[PDB]
Amino acid sequence: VALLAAVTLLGVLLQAYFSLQVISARRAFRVEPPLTTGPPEFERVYRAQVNCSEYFPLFLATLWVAGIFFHEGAAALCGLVYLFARLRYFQGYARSAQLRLAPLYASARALWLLVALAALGLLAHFLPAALRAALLGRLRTLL
Amino acid sequence: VALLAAVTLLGVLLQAYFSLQVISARRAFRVEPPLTTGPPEFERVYRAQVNCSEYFPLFLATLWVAGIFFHEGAAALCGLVYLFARLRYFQGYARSAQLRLAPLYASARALWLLVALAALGLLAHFLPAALRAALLGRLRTLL
Amino acid sequence: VALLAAVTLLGVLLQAYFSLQVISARRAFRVEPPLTTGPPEFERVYRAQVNCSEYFPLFLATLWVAGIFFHEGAAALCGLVYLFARLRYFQGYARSAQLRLAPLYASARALWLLVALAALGLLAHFLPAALRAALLGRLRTLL
Ligand SMILES: N[C@@H](CCC(=O)N[C@@H](CS)C(=O)NCC(=O)O)C(=O)O
Ligand SMILES: N[C@@H](CCC(=O)N[C@@H](CS)C(=O)NCC(=O)O)C(=O)O
Ligand SMILES: N[C@@H](CCC(=O)N[C@@H](CS)C(=O)NCC(=O)O)C(=O)O
């Protein structure tokens, strides 16, 4: 699990960092809490952090299931570029709501294929035992 | 864990699907990002996905703790109807903010009772060792 | 893991409780769903629950990685005061957007240091094997 736990720890650092950079723009544009609406910039910056936060648990499950049920090193490698394609994404959204697109592509690319591995790995586990049960019942005296 | 990991993988698929269906309504009603406010429909559809996303980690913990510390097959069965009662929920909220209620009931039903199992299972683990410690100290020479 | 699973179960209870208390203020100030905007109170109460929900997965990872890869009892103890410093936080934000600060301090205090432990623990695991690989290659005939 160690690499998986390393990648998750990056994720959490990355998430906390966006979170801090939202507090920064909240300061800059004098957007008093609990207001989450102001200039287009604060509204874009705050939005990135909000989308990253809603994709984090999806990324943590499936990272943990792609390692463990498919290969780990494979899973942790996707997990890694995904997080990078999310750093760049929040960097982008801060600039513009189109500088968010390029890294949002690299991110969903890496976020599926993690689903593919976790999917394959789980089928690689359930299918044999199923087909064994399927055939065993359908035998029946085999005369 | 395999069933637990199967149910979590469904969860992640279900979450990603809502996410995509929000992008669809974001397209339809021409709601340029980062705006999360428009017609009542986009505001309802976007809202479902936002509530589902905030209940996902609560559901992932407790799924994993109801299996493992109480029975797994039991946990995975609740996990399963919960996700269905969330598919139907987002389907509902899209229609109306009352067509969301019926599956929101079936969902909190399944989301507690998962807390009940995870609760029971954890007490089934800590209580014995506690009462053993309680009695051992209160002995004391037992004359 | 049992304490870690106990602390996570508290987290989930705490999260569900905020969630219920938002439904309460949603009722009180007649804020029909899917509106997430009204009086300053509903806007503060709803905001606390929204921030707590975005910090929960960050707290669940790192709790699980601070136990397991550093000491558990240590991890579960931080996890515990963090959740308390989040109960108090939502209590605070309900009162005012400054009665939120005091427990938000106690919370980020406990949320890092959990990152510190998970960080230390993961370095305590990877560094030896690395320096072993570093030295082994740089030998080379040691004449
Ligand atoms: N990551 C958080 C920063 C800390 C937080 O949870 N903010 C709280 C208390 S400081 C808040 O008032 N939310 C308003 C906001 O969206 O910044 C965020 O970006 O919202
Ligand atoms: N599941 C996401 C879809 C992808 C996403 O994270 N959206 C980002 C970048 S495409 C955004 O700009 N958020 C605005 C929104 O709420 O749709 C969502 O429903 O928001
Ligand atoms: N924890 C949730 C309560 C249940 C929920 O997910 N609310 C849904 C369906 S009842 C909703 O319509 N969201 C509007 C809201 O933010 O309360 C929350 O505070 O939003």
Side-chain angles (χ1 to χ4, degrees):
Chain A
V1 309
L3 297 174
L4 300 183
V7 175
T8 58
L9 193 65
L10 249 196
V12 177
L13 287 178
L14 190 51
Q15 287 293 304
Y17 156 80
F18 296 156
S19 161
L20 292 202
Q21 270 215 281
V22 154
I23 298 157
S24 84
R26 182 164 283 278
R27 290 192 189 284
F29 304 79
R30 307 258 186 148
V31 196
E32 186 50 13
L35 275 31
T36 52
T37 181
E41 187 189 353
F42 176 75
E43 287 191 24
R44 277 166 324 173
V45 170
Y46 161 75
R47 187 48 54 182
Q49 172 274 306
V50 155
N51 300 303
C52 290
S53 77
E54 70 195 16
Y55 276 105
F56 192 58
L58 274 70
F59 155 78
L60 291 198
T62 82
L63 168 67
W64 282 94
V65 180
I68 302 186
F69 277 87
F70 189 95
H71 182 231
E72 178 193 354
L77 201 80
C78 314
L80 189 62
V81 311
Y82 168 90
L83 294 178
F84 185 79
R86 281 323 194 104
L87 171 59
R88 279 189 15 229
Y89 166 82
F90 179 101
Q91 306 288 62
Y93 221 151
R95 289 293 192 128
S96 67
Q98 89 80 57
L99 287 175
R100 70 148 175 65
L101 278 150
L104 186 139
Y105 295 133
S107 78
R109 269 196 213 159
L111 184 145
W112 297 100
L113 170 77
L114 199 65
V115 178
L117 307 186
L120 286 178
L122 273 159
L123 265 299
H125 171 101
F126 279 106
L127 259 173
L131 304 182
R132 185 170 306 168
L135 259 72
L136 267 164
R138 206 196 354 115
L139 210 39
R140 180 65 201 186
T141 55
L142 70 103
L143 70 322
Chain B
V1 309
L3 297 174
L4 300 183
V7 175
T8 58
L9 193 65
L10 249 196
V12 177
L13 287 178
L14 190 51
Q15 287 293 304
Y17 156 80
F18 296 156
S19 161
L20 292 202
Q21 270 215 281
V22 154
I23 298 157
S24 84
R26 182 164 283 278
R27 290 192 189 284
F29 304 79
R30 307 258 186 148
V31 196
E32 186 50 13
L35 275 31
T36 52
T37 181
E41 187 189 353
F42 176 75
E43 287 191 24
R44 277 166 324 173
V45 170
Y46 161 75
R47 187 48 54 182
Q49 172 274 306
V50 155
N51 300 303
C52 290
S53 77
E54 70 195 16
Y55 276 105
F56 192 58
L58 274 70
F59 155 78
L60 291 198
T62 82
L63 168 67
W64 282 94
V65 180
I68 302 186
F69 277 87
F70 189 95
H71 182 231
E72 178 193 354
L77 201 80
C78 314
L80 189 62
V81 311
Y82 168 90
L83 294 178
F84 185 79
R86 281 323 194 104
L87 171 59
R88 279 189 15 229
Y89 166 82
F90 179 101
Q91 306 288 62
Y93 221 151
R95 289 293 192 128
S96 67
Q98 89 80 57
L99 287 175
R100 70 148 175 65
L101 278 150
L104 186 139
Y105 295 133
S107 78
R109 269 196 213 159
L111 184 145
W112 297 100
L113 170 77
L114 199 65
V115 178
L117 307 186
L120 286 178
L122 273 159
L123 265 299
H125 171 101
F126 279 106
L127 259 173
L131 304 182
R132 185 170 306 168
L135 259 72
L136 267 164
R138 206 196 354 115
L139 210 39
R140 180 65 201 186
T141 55
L142 70 103
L143 70 322
Chain C
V1 309
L3 297 174
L4 300 183
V7 175
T8 58
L9 193 65
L10 249 196
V12 177
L13 287 178
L14 190 51
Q15 287 293 304
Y17 156 80
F18 296 156
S19 161
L20 292 202
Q21 270 215 281
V22 154
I23 298 157
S24 84
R26 182 164 283 278
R27 290 192 189 284
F29 304 79
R30 307 258 186 148
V31 196
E32 186 50 13
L35 275 31
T36 52
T37 181
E41 187 189 353
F42 176 75
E43 287 191 24
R44 277 166 324 173
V45 170
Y46 161 75
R47 187 48 54 182
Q49 172 274 306
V50 155
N51 300 303
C52 290
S53 77
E54 70 195 16
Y55 276 105
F56 192 58
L58 274 70
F59 155 78
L60 291 198
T62 82
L63 168 67
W64 282 94
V65 180
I68 302 186
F69 277 87
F70 189 95
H71 182 231
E72 178 193 354
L77 201 80
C78 314
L80 189 62
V81 311
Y82 168 90
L83 294 178
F84 185 79
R86 281 323 194 104
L87 171 59
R88 279 189 15 229
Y89 166 82
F90 179 101
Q91 306 288 62
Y93 221 151
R95 289 293 192 128
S96 67
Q98 89 80 57
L99 287 175
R100 70 148 175 65
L101 278 150
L104 186 139
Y105 295 133
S107 78
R109 269 196 213 159
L111 184 145
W112 297 100
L113 170 77
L114 199 65
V115 178
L117 307 186
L120 286 178
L122 273 159
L123 265 299
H125 171 101
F126 279 106
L127 259 173
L131 304 182
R132 185 170 306 168
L135 259 72
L136 267 164
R138 206 196 354 115
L139 210 39
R140 180 65 201 186
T141 55
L142 70 103
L143 70 322

